[PDB]
Amino acid sequence: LFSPLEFGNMQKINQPDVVCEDPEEEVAPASCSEHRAECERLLTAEAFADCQDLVPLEPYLRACQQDRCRCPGGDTCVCSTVA
Amino acid sequence: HSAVDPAEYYKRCKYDTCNCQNNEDCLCAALSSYARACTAKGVMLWGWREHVCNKDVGSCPNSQVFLYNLTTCQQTCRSLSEA
Secondary structure (H helix, E strand, O other), X not given: OOOHHHHHXXXXXXXXXXXXXXXXXXXXXXXXXXXXXXXXXXXXXXXXXXXXXXXXXXXXXXXXXXXXXXXXXXXXXXXXXXX | OOOOOOHHHHHHHHHHHHHOOOHHHHHHHHHHHHHHHHHXXXXXXXXXXXXXXXXXXXXXXXXXXXXXXXXXXXXXXHHHHHO
């Protein structure tokens, strides 16, 4: 089971003018489940009524989990997922 | 150009540079091929490694410099013992 980082590193393209280093594996952070209620409330509002049956919910909220904790202060990452 | 007519080496240079994954090595190999071919007909290109393939010209030992006319019969005095 490939980890996302190595699988992404496999799809690199070699430009024969510049050498660019692949990002290294960062230490595994805590599961940002302390903000799950925030993402669930903001995402499942009334404005999104007639799409609860068209698109799933788990993936985007899971992404919001990291976005909320990885982007402290301004809410420039959370309102990029609901977009 | 007055002796070798590089018109046939140019397309091969492009071919090798475009094909192989390590492009710079093929580039230098192709240029060295034309240099050897021209030297074979009396015209020697002295100091052609100054913008293109000078990645190892300056790596020579302290008292030993990079040459363009290094020859087999230029070894130590151990060779001169037989000679």
